[PDB]
Symmetry: C3
Subunit: 114 residues, 3 copies
């Protein structure tokens, strides 16, 4: 699992421990061990959501499996909740794209997971 | 619809109104009201295109529907035109990836669109 | 072909000719002319991999074709090797996502490649 957050909120507004919390919460949500999880947080971005520059985020979650209708609703509740509580971004100014990756299309450690 | 532009043009060369211009023009092109459209512009990037560091852009357009052969050819004209006029990028140094998203794979407001 | 590498290693630790090397090596690996290859390197990122902020990278390679099981294993050896030699990133702290794009979904110069 790989989670990327792009946001216009300033870097100073990202709390200490945020990347750790994301790693832990995504491990619980996906069932995968934390060693597998990558997080990437990108603050201070030039963004608009609905033509407004108020706090917003564009995110993506890539995973080898564990992607689907019900799971994605659960991930959205979790991840919008964290962006609201920790970065003060309204959930209706967040988009999250979910991508189910084939293992043969994910490289790691000089090879692929195929 | 979500439109992302990655470019090596400096931040100071991105007009203040560019995000709003892109929002409005994408609303007209996709038929979706502007409240649904998100835009992200990423300047000052370390990039090469054809082995040259002259101005260039790598872009993505994600949308639930409104993606297809003919539509994508039309979007390329709209977006090349905007990047040429406002960021002074040659249109042969622009790539745009088009992604047709399933509503079940787009999170928003604690849920998904499915 | 389009290759993007996001990393937490500092900008100052990216060698001068790194973009050029990636372009030439991707041309040899993919068989496509360098004039069609785009490269994008993003240092200084806020990232965690397995819960650790030691040097890591999240990358993607997009191509119209030339993506597949054994091919992706070969790309991973090539690219992990370059990230290890030049950026000092351990290969077990690199993920690379491989994307086989339909030509109708790749825009360039006021049209698509279809
Ligand atoms: C998230 S994209 N992690 C990539 C690493 C990885 C390795 C194995 C598996 S498994 N055995 O299919 O659960 C998932 C993810
Ligand atoms: C772009 S990715 N917008 C996502 C939000 C969205 C997309 C489509 C529609 S609709 N009801 O099909 O017009 C609404 C909202
Ligand atoms: C990478 S995504 N390049 C853009 C698409 C593409 C693919 C192949 C060729 S060629 N000249 O036939 O090798 C050009 C452009």
């Amino acid at each position: 699992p790989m989670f990327i957050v792009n946001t216009n909120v300033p870097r100073a507004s990202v709390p200490d421990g945020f990347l750790s919390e994301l790693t832990q919460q995504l491990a619980q949500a996906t069932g995968k061990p934390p060693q597998y999880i990558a997080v990437h947080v990108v603050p201070d971005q030039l963004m608009a959501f609905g033509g407004s520059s108020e706090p917003c985020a564009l995110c993506s979650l890539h995973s080898i499996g564990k992607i689907g209708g019900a799971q994605n609703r659960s991930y959205s509740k979790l991840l919008c909740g964290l962006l609201a509580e920790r970065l003060r971004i309204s959930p209706d100014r967040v988009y999250i794209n979910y991508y189910d990756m084939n293992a043969a299309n994910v490289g790691w450690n000089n090879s692929t997971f195929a």
